[PDB]
Symmetry: C2
Subunit: 360 residues, 2 copies
């Protein structure tokens, strides 16, 4: 089967890498507001529905092409989504919106074994994001892979707390700690990037885009072979888990020092090594429209001893090297702006290995 990946570190053979082409700023609706830094709120308000800065997008395209060249050199087969104009305005019976991009394969696709699963998403501007990936998925389907699409939400107003009392990121953190998110439990919704894989155990977090109904859907769909565990963090990332708790090997995880895990003892009891990466050196002046400076730890493992890491973030490169992990340095500084690092910009389709348990 062309599709076969049970975790985040076995020898990578095939990967899907996203595109920066035609990326559009999403309209400033409540769920966008709840997943971005106040600093950028006026940018969303003014540029909503327009392309991201074209001079910036062009630099990202260049950086990503080079990343693909390096992947091919490292023996990895690269697939890319179809080019699409994300500015088209679509309309369902529940809402109207323009699209976002197909830059982050990790946000929408997740491979569990021989199965590729398309996440439902939770943003209105990402309702039709799966269209960029269908040519690839149908190809794998024709070659034997299982293909699943989690239930697509209506994304009607009921799925959101229109009046989410967030005036700043500190408020979101307080609300988050209270168990209050911009998304309700009206219907299942989730981004695939809120799940991180370790063989028979998958970890997920309830976030601004991934509700308990969405996690239960995954849990119920994957059982009995896979166990889905819910974990939480202090000052959690609004959406996605791969720049907070990035699992990099059998029993080894990178834990973001600013977002400590409440269930860290479960990992310590299992004898896992928790590594806290050095702080990011990315300029505070550099625009990160989504995500944060912690993209530095959003690494991609080519195998247990080869990591693709940012060329600029020397301190984390040095951490991997003292651990005997070969660093493959690639610069994606402008690509980061879109909200992702190496783990976000890819979706590992095939890794050489078997299904195993590491939590014991």
């Amino acid at each position: 089967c062309p599709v076969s990946s049970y975790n985040e570190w076995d020898p990578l053979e095939e990967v899907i890498v996203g595109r920066a082409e035609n990326a559009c700023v999403p309209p400033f609706t409540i769920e966008v507001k709840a997943n971005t830094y106040e600093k950028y709120w006026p940018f969303y308000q003014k540029q909503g529905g327009h392309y991201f800065p074209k001079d910036h997008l062009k630099k990202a395209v260049a950086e990503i092409e080079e990343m693909c060249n390096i992947l091919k050199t490292e023996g990895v087969t690269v697939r890319r989504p179809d080019p699409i104009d994300w500015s088209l305005k679509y309309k369902t019976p529940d809402f109207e919106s323009t699209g976002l991009y197909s830059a982050m394969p990790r946000d929408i696709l997740i491979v569990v074994g021989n199965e590729i699963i398309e996440a439902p998403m939770a943003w209105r501007s990402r309702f039709f994001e799966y269209r960029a990936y269908r040519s690839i998925i149908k190809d794998y389907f024709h070659r034997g892979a299982k293909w699943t699409t989690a239930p697509k939400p209506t994304m009607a107003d009921e799925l959101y707390n229109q009046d989410y009392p967030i005036h700043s990121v500190e408020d979101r953190h307080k609300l988050a700690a209270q168990g209050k998110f911009v998304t309700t439990e009206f219907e299942p919704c989730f981004d695939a990037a809120d799940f991180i894989r370790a063989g028979r155990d998958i970890f997920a977090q309830r976030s601004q885009v991934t509700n308990y109904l969405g996690i239960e859907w995954m849990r119920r769909h994957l059982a009995p072979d896979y166990r889905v565990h819910i974990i939480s963090f202090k000052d959690p990332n609004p959406m996605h888990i791969d720049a907070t708790f990035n699992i990099i090997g059998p029993g080894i995880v990178l834990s973001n020092p600013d977002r400590p895990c409440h269930q860290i003892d479960l990992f310590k009891k299992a004898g896992w090594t928790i590594i806290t990466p050095p702080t990011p050196i990315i300029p505070d002046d550099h625009p990160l429209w989504m995500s944060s400076k912690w993209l530095s730890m959003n690494v991609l493992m080519l195998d247990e001893k080869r990591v693709m890491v940012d060329a600029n973030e020397v301190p984390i490169q040095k951490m991997f090297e003292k651990l005997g992990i070969t660093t493959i340095k690639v610069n994606i500084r402008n690509a980061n702006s879109l909200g992702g690092g190496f783990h976000c910009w890819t979706c590992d389709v095939r890794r050489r290995g078997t299904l195993q348990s590491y939590l014991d």
Copy 2:
């Protein structure tokens, strides 16, 4: 689990019954043309995008309410889809269209065991038909049922043979025999009503709305527990199998005399009883916008010895009675016009019984 149905005849405990409210004539696109009788082509051309005749719809509503009263009297729990205005025009990045209705639960939902599966559909006017059923499905999901949505097609032009050389129903039959349908194999598509259940064995037909990719998707998704077999018929019904080969008990099937099954010997070898129902007596003057006069055999089994059958079709009532099967006569003459009989207007959610093999 509130959801549990392995076949078409075990004691029915819960059912979803469709609605005739706000039903809209679909625009006359190629796939509608390929699934209707020439006689009605000009009606689709003129009335496309408008409500079906309101005086006709009102009579159907009345007939269906009475059917529900009878179901409750027979001990069956009835659920209905949400009322929705099907006239809203929606737009995806591939096409624009108005909707159809939520009259036929059998066309979109199929229950296999404890799992409710939403079919992708193949008509543009039915892209958002699932919206009427989400309140019910989420309720069953909260109560323990598994819920699956087959991959929703883009329904881009590539899925259709825009130039399908059909000038009359005789042409469609000839093309059908040639293995040429209005739908291509561009992406998976299917209506749940092209599948009929008999425990571990499910039968499907490749039709104008159900392609081989769609059937393979079901086959791959249900294996190893269920086996999906493909069968074909002479002068097949354009879409849906339940008025051609309606399985009514362990090893007993109603076979439409005008559409004989090519693989009939597989059933005879298994010792199944094939019954050919008497001809329909429905007036040729009565409008059947979709389907045909064979709705008479589109019966619904309440259990092995209780069948819900049309009050007007006396000859088929007499056939069941000589077989010792109690006939529960209900008149749905105006409801038939929309394209369905009892099996079409319902989706059995819970039947009292176990998973078994009848093909041996």
